[PDB]
Each structure stands twice: as structure tokens, then as C-alpha cells.
């Protein structure tokens, strides 16, 4: 297929918020994953046209990527940390749904996800 429109990164009708944990999510969690040597395939939406993956968006109906997450955090799009955490989890789950064990992208996701989970274990106080 053609690619779908990307996930929105702002919405003028969605209440915005800053919280301690959202600040951590941007400045510690996303920052650390973004600079990782294996971040690059996850820094923007999957381009199924460029990668020649005709079935990607037939299989994956809730796409997510760290570029979208970064922009959402920068825009104060999320109301709470759980929304953000869910987007990271969606990103990883999609990778594991679509790709096979031992594919490079799966090895990369695994390494990023382990780092993610350690940082989430370390989430600060809500206030």
C-alpha cells in the first residue's frame, strides 16, 4: 500500500500537560534511546513504500515511532506518563509483530527496549 498519514503530534482540542514524569520521559528516557546507535530505524514512521513492505500497514494498524513520541513530548501532547509509555510499548510490539526473531531490526528493538525498561523502572515521583 501507500503509507498512511503519520500519527498526529498535536491536537488543538486535546488538553496538554507537563508533569515530572513526562519531563523525565523526554529528557532522560527518549534522550537516551534517541542517541543510541540502534535508534535510527525507529526515529520516524515506518516508510513501507521505501522499504518495499506491501503488507506492513495491513498487519500494523497502530503504527508508532520515536520521532512521533519526541514531537508529542515537545508539544506537551500527552496528559500523563502512561500515554507516553504506551506509545513506546506500541512501537516495540509492532516491531515484534511484523518482523521475525533474529532479524536485525528485532535485535535492535530488543536492545532499545531493555534500556527503556531500566529507565522506566527508574521513573521519578509523580509530583
Amino acid at each position: 500500500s501507500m503509507n498512511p498519514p503519520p500519527p498526529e503530534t498535536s491536537n488543538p482540542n486535546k488538553p496538554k500537560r507537563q508533569t515530572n514524569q513526562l519531563q523525565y520521559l523526554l529528557r532522560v528516557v527518549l534522550k537516551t534511546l534517541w542517541k543510541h546507535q540502534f535508534a535510527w530505524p525507529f526515529q520516524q514512521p515506518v516508510d513501507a513504500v521505501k522499504l518495499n513492505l506491501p503488507d506492513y500497514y495491513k498487519i500494523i494498524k497502530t503504527p508508532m515511532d520515536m520521532g512521533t513520541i519526541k514531537k508529542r513530548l515537545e508539544n506537551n501532547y500527552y496528559w500523563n506518563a502512561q500515554e507516553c509509555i504506551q506509545d513506546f510499548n506500541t512501537m516495540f510490539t509492532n516491531c515484534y509483530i511484523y518482523n521475525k526473531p533474529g532479524d536485525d531490526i528485532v535485535l535492535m528493538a530488543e536492545a532499545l527496549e531493555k534500556l527503556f525498561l531500566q529507565k522506566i523502572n527508574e521513573l521519578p515521583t509523580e509530583e
Partner: peptide, 8 residues
């Protein structure tokens, strides 16, 4: 796999 080789 589907996405090919990515690790240097």
C-alpha cells in the same frame, strides 16, 4: 529479514 540488514 523483511527489512534486511541494519547492524554495521
Amino acid at each position: 529479514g523483511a527489512k534486511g540488514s541494519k547492524i554495521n
